[PDB]
Amino acid sequence: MVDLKRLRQEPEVFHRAIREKGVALDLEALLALDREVQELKKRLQEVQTERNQVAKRVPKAPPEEKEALIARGKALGEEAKRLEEALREKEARLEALLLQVPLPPWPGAPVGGEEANREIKRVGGPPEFSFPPLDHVALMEKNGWWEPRISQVSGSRSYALKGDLALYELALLRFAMDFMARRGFLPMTLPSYAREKAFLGTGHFPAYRDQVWAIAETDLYLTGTAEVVLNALHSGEILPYEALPLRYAGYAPAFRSEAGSFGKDVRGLMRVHQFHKVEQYVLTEASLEASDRAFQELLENAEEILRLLELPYRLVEVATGDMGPGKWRQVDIEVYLPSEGRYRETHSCSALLDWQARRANLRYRDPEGRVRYAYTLNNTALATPRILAMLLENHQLQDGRVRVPQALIPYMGKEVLEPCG
Amino acid sequence: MVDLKRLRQEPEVFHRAIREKGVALDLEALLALDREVQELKKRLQEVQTERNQVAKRVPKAPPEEKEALIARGKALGEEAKRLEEALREKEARLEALLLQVPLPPWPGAPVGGEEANREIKRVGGPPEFSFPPLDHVALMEKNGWWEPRISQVSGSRSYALKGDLALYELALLRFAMDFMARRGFLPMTLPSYAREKAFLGTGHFPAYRDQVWAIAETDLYLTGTAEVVLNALHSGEILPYEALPLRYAGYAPAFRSEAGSFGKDVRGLMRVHQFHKVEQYVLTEASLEASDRAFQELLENAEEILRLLELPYRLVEVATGDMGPGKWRQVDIEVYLPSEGRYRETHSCSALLDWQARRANLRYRDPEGRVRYAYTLNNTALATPRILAMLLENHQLQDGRVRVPQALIPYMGKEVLEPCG
User: Fold this and answer.
1) What is the CATH number of the domain that holds B76?
2) Do B399 and B263 share a structural domain?
3) Annotated binding residues of A
């Protein structure tokens, strides 16, 4: 959500954001709907104002006149209800439209969709193999590291790991949490379900409603990211200025409903229904300089995890059509997947200004004792099983066995993943 | 599912077990429907026999007695239909109540409800405090180790952990997987959703359908235990004799809908909708000796985890009325909670013989080349957050901070859990 006041005194800006972000919103019809709601509230107070006057003098009008007063009361009642009923209808139609208004992107954002995205930097390279590499599926198959029978049990777009690779999944999530804690973020372990209110908060509702799995016969939904929970914990509080910035490293299982059959079809570990993700969340003050400082920290944290993991990556500046309605800036980190000769997204670093804070009601008391809407940022720390695709391929030995990066040896208890079952 | 042969030749046994386990099942009506269905099938075969036999003679027939043959053949036809149709209705219905038939309890199980449960043995002492012990809620509240705001985001029977306790949850989950892996069990990380077939396989459906959340607009349900997924893997395969026993240690987040209103105060870390659980599962040969040896191992693993964890525990034989329909034996392990002044269950060790093997279709080839239904067993290795409640209360120090058992210091890095706020 955006400031409505500013929506009417500067709609040109918001028109540019709607066009450039490819949002399917008619600004002008919104603004018109807004002036319906507004005229109606005025005429509705009027009618109850008249009715007040009538009701005052009903007894201690003569019997001769009090009858007329009653007739004017009833007709005013007809009015008040008729008017109120239309205002209601209109207000909720406005509220829905207002939940779609995009935040303007930062001035340097590439204009266009996915094609317009721009490579910032690249750190590292595709490994040079003294033997022809295997892909991650073939490595799993060979070493007995996953269970294909899971498909009959749970369905498509599902995975079960086994032997040393099951342990390696758990080692990676512990490693990400310890790394985060040592960087001053507050480590939390969280549930994977939430009420709708928490999804409106982040802007996953309404725009990405189709990506989410509902729990039948409840008012709960399964979450795609710990960001849904982390963002709603402080909803309705006025945080002290000295709390800021709030730095949260939240772990939770995550769930996704779909995506229209995959961009290198369906599977491996690449696109699955259920996964594990450690997210970084930042709640800061309503300045651009504090948002910019936080953005650079979240980014460097992800870069540092990839360096410790010994992975080749690159940073990419995300274009206006690819960002989302609520983003000011987004930089993606992509890792090299040798089997597909391609960089593949592993992290996504976003600055949302006060677009989520206006919808989730997150506020602080500034240094001058003014109550403001805070600024929110987020990035991934580590999600499994997607990085296991990259680790296996980049670190495969002639054998088909896999090397464990140095920083991960204390967590595994070994230098080499071994074949199982 | 039980063997209908054994059922037909020993209903004495199944009747005793229906009432001993408090099963809402009329055995006479079941045995009635069985006979009806068998006689119908016999008859339908006699008709099909003569119906065809007749026609072979109808080609070759003196006009004289071709009337006789059309007559008899048409009557046979009309009857084949009524038999086909009746056998539809009944065979369907007999299936529905074969699924309710209970396995007989082991001879030595106490008869009666939850009251008839019998302490076998208790190991170790309640802790001796040089100060007034706090309960687990007061220790988390004092040290800022839980996020009370989670109730607004996710409703009640939610928890969110912070700081050193969040890390401690992840450490225990990895400890249990390492312990299990060192004990010859095969480690796996699994989904938390499965198709209906997997739930019928275990006996969760139809008896405990109430305890299970469904993912709306889908054929998937969330699992309350890794057993549901573990038991459906080898469904429909004939395992070779040399593969046996299968020992699996599965990890998965677990969900419960809590159609479980309460008794009197349990509302801290005790009855949450979402938790993490490492399960022991054994698939063995159809021998009692083999079941009992597996049962003993499964229990010793759990006793050893509790010793490693420095917790006082007891063993309880579960009564016939508290087992559930599929069990032969059930032994609960319970841990001392100082604030309540009593033992609360942490582990539950079950032997199901071939009751779930007949539902899930799990089979092996025995040493003589005959194909048999396998025997299954299961037990918790470690579940969080319920074990944390016991760890905090038993390991609390004077200052309100909590000691880490020797076995876990390598998983934590520290010897004592530190407050955050």
Assistant:
1) 1.10.287.40
2) yes
3) 225-227, 256-258, 272, 279, 345-348, 380
